[PDB]
Write an enzyme that holds these catalytic residues in place. Sequence first.
Site, PDB file in Angstrom:
ATOM      1  N   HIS A 107       9.820  -3.029 -20.548  1.00  0.00           N
ATOM      2  CA  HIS A 107       8.521  -2.251 -20.914  1.00  0.00           C
ATOM      3  C   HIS A 107       8.734  -1.963 -22.395  1.00  0.00           C
ATOM      4  O   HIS A 107       9.393  -0.994 -22.889  1.00  0.00           O
ATOM      5  CB  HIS A 107       8.011  -1.156 -20.153  1.00  0.00           C
ATOM      6  CG  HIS A 107       8.203  -1.530 -18.757  1.00  0.00           C
ATOM      7  ND1 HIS A 107       9.229  -1.532 -17.872  1.00  0.00           N
ATOM      8  CD2 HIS A 107       7.117  -1.505 -18.232  1.00  0.00           C
ATOM      9  CE1 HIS A 107       8.580  -1.653 -16.696  1.00  0.00           C
ATOM     10  NE2 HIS A 107       7.326  -1.711 -16.779  1.00  0.00           N
ATOM     11  N   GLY A 132       9.440   7.162 -13.266  1.00  0.00           N
ATOM     12  CA  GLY A 132       9.199   5.943 -12.774  1.00  0.00           C
ATOM     13  C   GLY A 132       7.887   5.949 -11.936  1.00  0.00           C
ATOM     14  O   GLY A 132       7.008   5.142 -11.843  1.00  0.00           O
ATOM     15  N   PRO A 133       8.111   6.757 -10.947  1.00  0.00           N
ATOM     16  CA  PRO A 133       6.814   6.870  -9.998  1.00  0.00           C
ATOM     17  C   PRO A 133       6.001   7.890 -10.940  1.00  0.00           C
ATOM     18  O   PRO A 133       6.103   8.896 -11.190  1.00  0.00           O
ATOM     19  CB  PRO A 133       7.234   7.631  -8.798  1.00  0.00           C
ATOM     20  CG  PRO A 133       8.769   7.004  -8.717  1.00  0.00           C
ATOM     21  CD  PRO A 133       9.106   7.415 -10.045  1.00  0.00           C
ATOM     22  N   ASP A 176      -1.578   7.371 -19.853  1.00  0.00           N
ATOM     23  CA  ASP A 176      -2.770   7.251 -19.014  1.00  0.00           C
ATOM     24  C   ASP A 176      -2.782   7.225 -17.288  1.00  0.00           C
ATOM     25  O   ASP A 176      -3.106   7.745 -16.671  1.00  0.00           O
ATOM     26  CB  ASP A 176      -3.555   5.891 -19.473  1.00  0.00           C
ATOM     27  CG  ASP A 176      -3.827   6.022 -20.849  1.00  0.00           C
ATOM     28  OD1 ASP A 176      -4.297   7.144 -21.326  1.00  0.00           O
ATOM     29  OD2 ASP A 176      -3.571   5.048 -21.430  1.00  0.00           O
ATOM     30  N   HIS A 203       2.820  -4.209 -22.448  1.00  0.00           N
ATOM     31  CA  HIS A 203       3.108  -2.991 -21.569  1.00  0.00           C
ATOM     32  C   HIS A 203       4.466  -3.234 -20.972  1.00  0.00           C
ATOM     33  O   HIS A 203       5.348  -2.371 -21.073  1.00  0.00           O
ATOM     34  CB  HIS A 203       2.033  -2.748 -20.615  1.00  0.00           C
ATOM     35  CG  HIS A 203       2.599  -1.884 -19.560  1.00  0.00           C
ATOM     36  ND1 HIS A 203       2.849  -0.712 -19.393  1.00  0.00           N
ATOM     37  CD2 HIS A 203       2.959  -2.407 -18.211  1.00  0.00           C
ATOM     38  CE1 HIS A 203       3.440  -0.262 -18.238  1.00  0.00           C
ATOM     39  NE2 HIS A 203       3.228  -1.398 -17.558  1.00  0.00           N
ATOM     40  N   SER A 223       0.199  31.868   7.253  1.00  0.00           N
ATOM     41  CA  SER A 223       0.501  30.850   8.505  1.00  0.00           C
ATOM     42  C   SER A 223       1.747  30.304   8.496  1.00  0.00           C
ATOM     43  O   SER A 223       2.485  30.297   9.579  1.00  0.00           O
ATOM     44  CB  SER A 223      -0.626  29.547   8.627  1.00  0.00           C
ATOM     45  OG  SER A 223      -2.139  30.167   8.940  1.00  0.00           O
ATOM     46  N   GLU A 236       0.024  20.275  -2.236  1.00  0.00           N
ATOM     47  CA  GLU A 236       1.155  19.991  -1.710  1.00  0.00           C
ATOM     48  C   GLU A 236       2.068  19.033  -2.489  1.00  0.00           C
ATOM     49  O   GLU A 236       3.257  19.162  -2.725  1.00  0.00           O
ATOM     50  CB  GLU A 236       1.416  19.490  -0.166  1.00  0.00           C
ATOM     51  CG  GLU A 236       0.638  20.162   0.890  1.00  0.00           C
ATOM     52  CD  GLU A 236      -0.795  19.886   0.903  1.00  0.00           C
ATOM     53  OE1 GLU A 236      -1.501  19.187  -0.064  1.00  0.00           O
ATOM     54  OE2 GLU A 236      -1.490  20.793   1.560  1.00  0.00           O
ATOM     55  N   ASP A 264      -5.749  22.986  16.463  1.00  0.00           N
ATOM     56  CA  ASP A 264      -6.402  22.278  15.194  1.00  0.00           C
ATOM     57  C   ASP A 264      -6.215  20.774  15.378  1.00  0.00           C
ATOM     58  O   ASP A 264      -6.924  20.035  14.749  1.00  0.00           O
ATOM     59  CB  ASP A 264      -5.310  22.600  14.193  1.00  0.00           C
ATOM     60  CG  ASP A 264      -5.941  24.002  13.551  1.00  0.00           C
ATOM     61  OD1 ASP A 264      -6.797  24.616  13.613  1.00  0.00           O
ATOM     62  OD2 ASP A 264      -5.058  24.374  12.662  1.00  0.00           O
ATOM     63  N   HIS A 274      -3.703  17.396  12.581  1.00  0.00           N
ATOM     64  CA  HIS A 274      -2.855  18.530  11.936  1.00  0.00           C
ATOM     65  C   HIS A 274      -1.616  18.106  12.753  1.00  0.00           C
ATOM     66  O   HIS A 274      -0.593  18.846  12.158  1.00  0.00           O
ATOM     67  CB  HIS A 274      -3.320  19.794  12.324  1.00  0.00           C
ATOM     68  CG  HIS A 274      -4.267  20.228  11.356  1.00  0.00           C
ATOM     69  ND1 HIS A 274      -5.499  19.508  10.911  1.00  0.00           N
ATOM     70  CD2 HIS A 274      -4.279  21.343  10.705  1.00  0.00           C
ATOM     71  CE1 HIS A 274      -6.018  20.197  10.060  1.00  0.00           C
ATOM     72  NE2 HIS A 274      -5.574  21.414   9.982  1.00  0.00           N
ATOM     73  N   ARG A 277       4.842  26.709  15.560  1.00  0.00           N
ATOM     74  CA  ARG A 277       3.787  27.986  15.671  1.00  0.00           C
ATOM     75  C   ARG A 277       4.023  28.613  16.900  1.00  0.00           C
ATOM     76  O   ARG A 277       3.638  29.878  16.824  1.00  0.00           O
ATOM     77  CB  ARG A 277       2.298  27.351  15.796  1.00  0.00           C
ATOM     78  CG  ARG A 277       1.339  28.169  15.604  1.00  0.00           C
ATOM     79  CD  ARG A 277      -0.128  27.513  15.904  1.00  0.00           C
ATOM     80  NE  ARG A 277      -1.246  28.219  15.864  1.00  0.00           N
ATOM     81  CZ  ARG A 277      -2.052  28.889  16.801  1.00  0.00           C
ATOM     82  NH1 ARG A 277      -2.053  28.309  18.010  1.00  0.00           N
ATOM     83  NH2 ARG A 277      -3.183  29.697  16.383  1.00  0.00           N
TER      84      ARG A 277
END
Lengths: 675, 675
Positions: free
Chosen positions: B25, B112-113, B153, B259, B381, B413, B472, B476, B523
């Site tokens: 690149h 990279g990601p 971007d 690019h 929780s 998350e 739930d 879940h 739980r």
Amino acid sequence: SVDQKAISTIRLLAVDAVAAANSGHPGAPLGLAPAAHAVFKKMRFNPKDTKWINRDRFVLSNGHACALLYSMLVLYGYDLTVEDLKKFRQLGSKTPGHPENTDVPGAEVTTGPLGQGICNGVGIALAQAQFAATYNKPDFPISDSYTYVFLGDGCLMEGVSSEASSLAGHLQLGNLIAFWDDNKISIDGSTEVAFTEDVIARYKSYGWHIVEVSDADTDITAIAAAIDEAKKVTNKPTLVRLTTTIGFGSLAQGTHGVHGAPLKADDIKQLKTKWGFNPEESFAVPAEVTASYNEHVAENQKIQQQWNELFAAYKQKYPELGAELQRRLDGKLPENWDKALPVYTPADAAVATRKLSEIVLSKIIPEVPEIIGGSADLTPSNLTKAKGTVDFQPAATGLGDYSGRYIRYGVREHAMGAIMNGIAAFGANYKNYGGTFLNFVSYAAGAVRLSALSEFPITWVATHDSIGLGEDGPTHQPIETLAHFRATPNISVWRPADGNETSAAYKSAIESTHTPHILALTRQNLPQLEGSSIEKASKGGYTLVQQDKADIIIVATGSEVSLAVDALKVLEGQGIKAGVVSLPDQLTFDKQSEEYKLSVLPDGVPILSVEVMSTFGWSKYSHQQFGLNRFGASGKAPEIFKLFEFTPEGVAERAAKTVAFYKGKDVVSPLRSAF
Amino acid sequence: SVDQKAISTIRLLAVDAVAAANSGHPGAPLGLAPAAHAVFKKMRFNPKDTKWINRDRFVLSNGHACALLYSMLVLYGYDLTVEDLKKFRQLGSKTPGHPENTDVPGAEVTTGPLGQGICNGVGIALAQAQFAATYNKPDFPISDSYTYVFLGDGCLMEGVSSEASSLAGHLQLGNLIAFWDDNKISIDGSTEVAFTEDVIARYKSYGWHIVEVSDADTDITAIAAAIDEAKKVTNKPTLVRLTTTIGFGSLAQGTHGVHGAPLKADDIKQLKTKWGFNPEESFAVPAEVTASYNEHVAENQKIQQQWNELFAAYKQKYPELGAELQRRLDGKLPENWDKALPVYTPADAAVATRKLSEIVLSKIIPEVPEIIGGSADLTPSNLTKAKGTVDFQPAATGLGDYSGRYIRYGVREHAMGAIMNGIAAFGANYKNYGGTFLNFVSYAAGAVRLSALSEFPITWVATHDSIGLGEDGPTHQPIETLAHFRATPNISVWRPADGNETSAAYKSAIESTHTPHILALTRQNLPQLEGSSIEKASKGGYTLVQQDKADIIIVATGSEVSLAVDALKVLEGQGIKAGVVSLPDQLTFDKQSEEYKLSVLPDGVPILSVEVMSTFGWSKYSHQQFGLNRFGASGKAPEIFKLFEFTPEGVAERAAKTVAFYKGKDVVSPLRSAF
Ligand SMILES: C=C1[C@H](CCOP(=O)(O)OP(=O)(O)O)SCN1Cc1cnc(C)nc1N
Ligand SMILES: C=C1[C@H](CCOP(=O)(O)OP(=O)(O)O)SCN1Cc1cnc(C)nc1N
Ligand SMILES: O=C(CO)[C@@H](O)[C@H](O)[C@H](O)COP(=O)(O)O
Ligand SMILES: O=C(CO)[C@@H](O)[C@H](O)[C@H](O)COP(=O)(O)O
Ligand SMILES: [Ca+2]
Ligand SMILES: [Ca+2]
């Protein structure tokens, strides 16, 4: 008034449902009942025909608030009753703790995982715009429906909603009307602890219109006016800020405690008495409310009746388009559409499966108008656009039109996944797809899993499937990815080896009505195989090379099928006879008859799997597994294959060791089990 | 000038590296070389000590532009040479196609990601603020470093960056300075096709400061001034808008073609001649540039020398804090910290592993100052906050302080995962954790995978691990989740069964230096087991109930270990003798000696696995597998277990069928293989 009584009825049904279960979420239902009442009064829908194609759609993105949704559906006479509400959150009920489109009449999508529903709404609205642009004619507004979404602070924090909101603003989706439950409370308490951004300023930056309702606890007149205002703004999606009190009316209103646990019994009593209900009674439905709601249903049914006559008149005036629309609403693909699928022979040149995919799309897109799709900023790498098609864009931009068929998703895999679910949810037989690199399908796992749970026939065009991609290296090379999605119920994960297998993968993906597809495709060229066909690959697994006196069978997928065939030749020189099985989709294979599967993976012969990624799952089909259970490397792809011994000689060595390991042992098919 | 020559040198090294590889690149490196030159001149760093704790950090979030980063590191005399640049993208080189912290000296994180690096920068900055608040004293600025991030971007489109930018703005992280490469080009072409939002307005809505540099192709004076301006704004992160031309100087500048593919040879020639370089020469490094850069290195080394003396003086004045800091910089936990881990007996009450986790954190947080962590809006929780601790917040809010130890991540998350990676990357022995429900760890897969590839000792406190969560429901309840992460290289996935196992899981997570941990927690309440201990559970798998005349061994994890023990009693009544193995972490178990593993999973006895989620992976340890390979249900948890026959009788039935299936067969350990 009757409106006030309806709002109280909704609130108390929701609280009573939570009370009966001793589980669930009363706060947002209490806060949003005025808005729900106002929105459903503006919506066009038929409780007796949940699939009317010109209905307005409603999506509860804050899915934990589903006692609210269920109360609306019950009050309006959907196929959901007070007896179902009494079974809220109970095993086998039609009122699960989060809404499921497969189980709940009038649930358009499955929500509960925050952020998804708003993105699904973007997809429903995208589909409606594309559908209307395709079919509407002067005096024939076949499609003119709106998409209404409720969302909370949690959805606004999840990055997937930012992706979809940026894109929806860019796409000028004027029939999308979203409502933010601005109650300043999440599970951890005040939004002041973690969420102090200027949401309204952010939405303006995306190109959304804003309406603010400062007293959404009571001001249904202003909520209705906000909808009317939004409908006048035809080139922007609208966010309506609903300033509410979470748990409005509860002793514990405006606190995190009312978000997600049942109210105290004495709290429920004072709710009832303050609103004129009997504190000794649960699940009250005043007949005035039923009557008022039935009036609106009857009006809506007359609108649908008139729409049906419009559709009949459309078929007379526009016979070709009318027949196409009828076919799609009947859930049927064009007759013999699959005759357009490319077919290859072993004399044809080697081609990468990403390029074979491009060729399939180029042949089938002109034949099947309900196919639309896009890429997450990888169009020239995934090869997902058919030459000559136009992009889905607002015409005002000059970059496309709403009749377009190709979506520029940008670098937004997660939203692309959830938008695909919305497009599928719209209906009208849409068969929609989204391209990215296989390794970055993982960015969209939240949505992918919901495709499976929701039974939506969406398709991921997931190129660059392995170390075969080469120099981009281990941050780009899948290892765990197929195992992850194969381990998810109801995902077809195709990894076609050649031209014929790629056509079978698309036949499955497009014919699907209840199963999402991931097509794992190569960067690198692969040979056309002796023995492949659409017919055989359509079985998910098949015998490519039959060897009646096999010492071993090698089962492989994708790029490793050619490798297995080359290994067979090496083995012949070592005095070992091998057969080869190609397993382009494990799910499709699993669904075949026990007898068919045993014809592919018989008893009495060792079976070795070969696939250049995780060995997880492979023991279903093999006794020994040759895979890659470490991260990859940055280099020329053939050198990486050599490093990890994915060569004809490396496969043969492991095949020979497998034969030796089972010498003097009784071997039964991996398909056998004790239970 | 020499500055101009340095910029040209950087540009041409990057283009020559891409040319040599015939892969990579060149566009963003050409566009960002002026900014890179300016930023590195402002940065304090020692190429000969990459771990100096008060260095400024640089992160290349647009990791595909790594030829730029590698060129800077080579020019500044890091342990990376022109010969390494000549091996760009080649197998085994120190210059992989995207930067890897494990392989590249001076790469703080693995990028990279897209979207990850900016979030990692937020984490580095969060850690620096926490570290400075903990250790700095009057006249002792132990920590005062900045975090510089380049992003494009693509990173701005990825939802994870929105999450982290919202949170960074909320947290008033004034030492974070990010630079947007505003070049209006992504892979699909102009940003006009998919990315038309007002980025600057969005960043203002998050509470960031903005500086705009309208000619970042040339105006290094303005880039330097933008840094100075950002440093004056101590209570906001800053976004510097760098308006650049992608591929600046190339014949193909300002196009998507520049690019991600090598430049044409004639293009490289005209680049060289326009900038005064020899078009016949590659990898030129003018000695003027080396000298200029060495001057800056020498100055920085004198700054570090003075910092070392500051640190010595700090240890004299603040002996307690000084010793703590020394220990942390040496990578050592407090001596005998693990004596704080709770220990249980079989006489103790049943406790959910989420609650056991809370108790562990309550005991170890006061003992180990380098532990910080948070939750993604699930604090009450997940049970992730120790009572009495204060939250990490800017003191100006009144809600916490930068010396705080508990992070309110909000419903974010993915960003939480990438921020955790940044906190680990900061160093100083930080052992950091993040809570959510196990099913929503999947939202953060992009970051989790990078924790594994980057070898960062981060910890997910992943509660609500199964259908045991109950009402739930299936949106879940994890099914595929453990298989996904266990199939990823280098992830310890602990699923502790009881109090002692939960303490072992934390011992592993906190002692880790190179392996991320996911703690799958319940739980529902589980009994304390007869036979468990920290010592035995620390081996990853162990014999819980030894049966020398076993007809079958049942191997289980977490909540299913108690189930297996109850099944053993049912089996005794049917005349079948069972042993029980607990396998709290498959990775830790796999790392034990072959002899140890065979003592747990011997030859000559059938082995049945029991775990209420996917059966993928389990054939490593068992002959038959009882798992859950369909989605769950909304209901009371015990009723769901009964529905799927995860009961003592259901396990016993399958155990009996397993014994019968192997009658008269020779059975070897699942640990055996042909290769
Ligand atoms: C953190 C939460 C939610 C709190 C959300 O607060 P708002 O959304 O502000 O709700 P309100 O308080 O107004 O009722 S409900 C459950 N959820 C856990 C959860 C986490 N991650 C994902 C992806 N999906 C989830 N459901
Ligand atoms: C789509 C792309 C990128 C184009 C990004 O454009 P900018 O980021 O605008 O780059 P610039 O054109 O200025 O050089 S590079 C590779 N990438 C694929 C990719 C997809 N998804 C994720 C998560 N990670 C990836 N690397
Ligand atoms: O993911 C990235 C870089 O982070 C893209 O720039 C790819 O490098 C490119 O799309 C691959 O291109 P081809 O594999 O199609 O040559
Ligand atoms: O995910 C959600 C709803 O979408 C949360 O509101 C959970 O329902 C709640 O946090 C579970 O609470 P406990 O399991 O701790 O009772
Ligand atoms: Ca809220
Ligand atoms: Ca760009």
